[PDB]
Amino acid sequence: PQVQFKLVLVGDGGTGKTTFVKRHLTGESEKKYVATLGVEVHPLVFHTNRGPIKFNVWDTAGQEKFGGLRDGYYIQAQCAIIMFDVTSRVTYKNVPNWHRDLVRVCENIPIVLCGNKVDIKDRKVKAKSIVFHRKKNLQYYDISAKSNYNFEKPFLWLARKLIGDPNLEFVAMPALAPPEVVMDPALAAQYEHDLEVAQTTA
Amino acid sequence: RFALVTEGHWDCSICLVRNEPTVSRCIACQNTKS
Numbered sequence A: 001p002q003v004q005f006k007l008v009l010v011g012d013g014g015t016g017k018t019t020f021v022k023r024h025l026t027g028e029s030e031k032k033y034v035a036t037l038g039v040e041v042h043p044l045v046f047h048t049n050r051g052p053i054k055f056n057v058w059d060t061a062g063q064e065k066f067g068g069l070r071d072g073y074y075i076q077a078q079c080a081i082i083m084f085d086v087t088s089r090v091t092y093k094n095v096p097n098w099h100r101d102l103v104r105v106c107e108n109i110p111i112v113l114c115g116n117k118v119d120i121k122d123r124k125v126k127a128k129s130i131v132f133h134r135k136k137n138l139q140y141y142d143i144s145a146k147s148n149y150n151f152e153k154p155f156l157w158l159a160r161k162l163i164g165d166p167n168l169e170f171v172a173m174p175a176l177a178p179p180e181v182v183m184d185p186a187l188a189a190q191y192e193h194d195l196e197v198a199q200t201t202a
Numbered sequence B: 001r002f003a004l005v006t007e008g009h010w011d012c013s014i015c016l017v018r019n020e021p022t023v024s025r026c027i028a029c030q031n032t033k034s
């Protein structure tokens, strides 16, 4: 049997959770539908310098738009990604609510915070806002699901925490759906610069 | 090499959660061990 972790992917509706998990082509073709809970489980394999790791990513069927998710969705979650939309401030405002629900049923599992849709010029939630409200034990990454931008970074960070190996590496990128929008390198360089300065600011 | 290491423990065929040998229903999705 294989090394695998249940990863719960939560965040407001419309933030791009489904679009994001679907970039992993094999995880999409081999996804599994849980009828009793309305969940699609995507087995995402990543190949590390110490062998393969599987993140079984639990993706909702939209139920988050109307209320809290049932406990079964969170049970045995070993890691999580909280997603919000950089073009919608309310999705960031709700991040602590998702955090609370995770810690209630899962406690101190490793968690990554992802701001999605950074490919859009008219960004609203910027590096200053996210780094000002940075919470310890909560790594953050800019991501753009439609462009595959930074796709592997949440999973690499989680794998290091879960394995307890700061030197874990992915030896190759997984097969990803080809980008549907271009991530302008200038925006990427800017948002990356804005994030570094905001983190090393005195 | 330090390759990652992997008895009645069973993986749910439906949702892939690993379950204890003591249980017969999946603790997460409540489906029964095949």
Ligand SMILES: Nc1nc2c(ncn2[C@@H]2O[C@H](COP(=O)(O)OP(=O)(O)O)[C@@H](O)[C@H]2O)c(=O)[nH]1
Binding pocket: A011, A012, A013, A014, A015, A016, A017, A018, A019, A020, A116, A117, A118, A119, A120, A143, A144, A145, A146, A147, A181
């Ligand atoms: N420009 C851009 N649009 C995105 C991105 N991710 C999602 N969108 C769109 O956001 C809408 C909701 O996407 P979805 O994956 O269903 O979010 P979910 O409700 O959290 O699962 C859709 O119209 C997506 O096409 C992105 O990374 N960049």
Ligand SMILES: [Mg+2]
Binding pocket: A017, A018, A019, A060, A061, A062
């Ligand atoms: Mg969705």
Ligand SMILES: [Zn+2]
Binding pocket: B012, B013, B014, B015, B016, B017, B026, B027, B028, B029, B030, B031
């Ligand atoms: Zn199950």
